[PDB]
Amino acid sequence: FQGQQDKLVLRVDGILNELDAQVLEGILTRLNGVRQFRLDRISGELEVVFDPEVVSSRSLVDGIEEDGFGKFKLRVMS
């Protein structure tokens, strides 16, 4: 059956147009351990459901930043 599923809530800055959003969605879809996500392109709110046994929140946030080439600024919301 399915495994552990944790959630990470993020504020994303740097989405200036529809192209930037699709770039970000592409990064998330290719990131190992990401199971689902919801992105509001206008507010920058991003929720990510990930398997904590495959990727940690630490590695997940770092991965998006690295894959984004500094275009996206990530802040974790509590």
Residue numbers in the entry: 21 to 98
Per the authors:
The copper-transporting P-type ATPase RAN1 (HMA7), located in the same membrane, is known to be essential for the biogenesis of ETRs. The AlphaFold2 model also predicts three domains at the N-terminal end, all with ATX1-like folds (henceforth referred to as MBDs) and a Cα atom RMSD < 1 Å with respect to each other.
To corroborate the AlphaFold2 23,28 prediction of a third ATX1-like fold domain at the N-terminus of RAN1, we expressed, purified, and analyzed this predicted domain by X-ray crystallography. The crystal structure was determined by molecular replacement (MR) using the AlphaFold2 23,28 prediction of RAN1 (AlphaFold DB: Q9S7J8) cut to the sequence of MBD3 as a template. The structure was refined to a resolution of 1.98 Å with Rfree = 23.5% and Rwork = 19.2%, and MBD3 of RAN1 was modeled to completeness. The asymmetric unit comprises two molecules with an overall structural similarity (mutual RMSD = 0.355 Å; RMSDs to the AlphaFold2 model = 0.501/0.641 Å). However, the third domain (MBD3), which is the most distant from the N-terminus and the closest to the transmembrane domain, lacks the typical CBM. The cysteines have been substituted with asparagine and aspartate, in accordance with the results of sequence analysis by a multiple sequence alignment using Clustal Omega33. Noteworthy, a structurally related SxxS (SSRS) sequence motif is present in a loop region and α-helix 2 close to the C-terminus on the opposite side of the protein.
